[PDB]
Design a protein around this ligand. Structure first.
Ligand SMILES: *[C@@H]1O[C@H](CO)[C@@H](O)[C@H](O)[C@H]1NC(C)=O
Ligand SMILES: *[C@@H]1O[C@H](CO)[C@@H](O)[C@H](O)[C@H]1NC(C)=O
Lengths: 48, 48, 48, 97
């Protein structure tokens, strides 16, 4: 799997999943971030 | 229009009609609230 | 029988017909399209 | 002097709040599009993993008639589906039947 770069283009097409129709999703949401920033931070974890 | 219902009584495309209406936040009275996954009892007063 | 209500049904104008009829407990009480209107209610056996 | 058992005022009403998690289906925003197709070029949209209210949808589309085959409108309320496939077009009046 891999992603492509929409701004400068790419030699390959984007393909990380091959679902012809949308699969089951328990969560779907879009968030916004300041594009002028130099760094982004993320926390991912599990419990029970 | 034609509504085709795939995978009935399963998945995540749900209806919120039989989900309790948000109603009104009653103030100055005791209520058995369930706010954002946590339950309790209390009295609500509006503030800025 | 005396003292009993007949099978609940309704007439609706469909297929350009004036007396197309619909009824409760369809297709059958197990796979009922809605247990709310069906007079036969699902019930687990109690002790004894 | 006896301090009796502490009683509690019973709650009167209930209040519930939860983020809807999944996005709204916005079925009305696709059915109310003014650029409607003909039956020759019928459009299709699949509503998967989203929340909807048919009680409000019918008011927002101004429904003329609604019926179900192999299902009932009453069970759409509170039910979950893998995906809802929706197909639409304008009706040529002489072909309504
Ligand atoms: C999130 O953003 C992408 C790119 O703008 C868009 O294709 C996608 O439909 C959006 N999804 C949601 C849930 O808004
Ligand atoms: C966006 O990021 C840049 C660089 O960190 C900063 O100068 C700018 O003030 C930020 N703007 C907003 C609206 O946060």
């Amino acid at each position: 799997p891999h992603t492509i770069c929409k701004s400068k283009g790419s030699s390959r097409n984007e393909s990380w999943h091959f679902d012809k129709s949308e699969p089951l999703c328990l969560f779907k949401k879009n968030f916004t971030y300041n594009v002028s920033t130099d760094w982004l931070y993320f926390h991912f974890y599990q419990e029970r | 229009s034609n509504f085709i219902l795939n995978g009935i009584n399963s998945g995540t495309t749900c209806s919120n009609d039989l989900l309790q209406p948000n109603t009104e936040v009653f103030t100055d009275v005791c209520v058995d609230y369930d706010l954002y996954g946590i339950t309790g009892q209390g009295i609500f007063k509006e503030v800025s | 029988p005396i003292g009993t209500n007949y099978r609940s049904c309704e007439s609706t104008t469909v297929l350009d017909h004036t007396d197309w009829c619909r009824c409760s407990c369809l297709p059958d009480p197990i796979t009922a399209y809605d247990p709310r209107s069906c007079s036969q209610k699902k019930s687990l056996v109690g002790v004894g | 002097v006896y301090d009796l058992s502490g009683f509690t005022v019973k709650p009167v009403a209930t209040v519930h709040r939860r983020i809807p998690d999944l996005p709204d289906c916005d079925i009305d925003k696709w059915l109310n599009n003014f650029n409607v197709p003909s039956p020759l070029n019928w459009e299709r949209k699949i509503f998967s993993n989203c929340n909807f209210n048919l009680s409000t949808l019918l008011r927002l589309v101004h429904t003329d008639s609604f019926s179900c085959n192999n299902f009932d409108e009453s069970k759409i309320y509170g039910s979950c589906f893998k995906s809802i496939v929706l197909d639409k077009f304008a009706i040529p009046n002489s072909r309504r039947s």
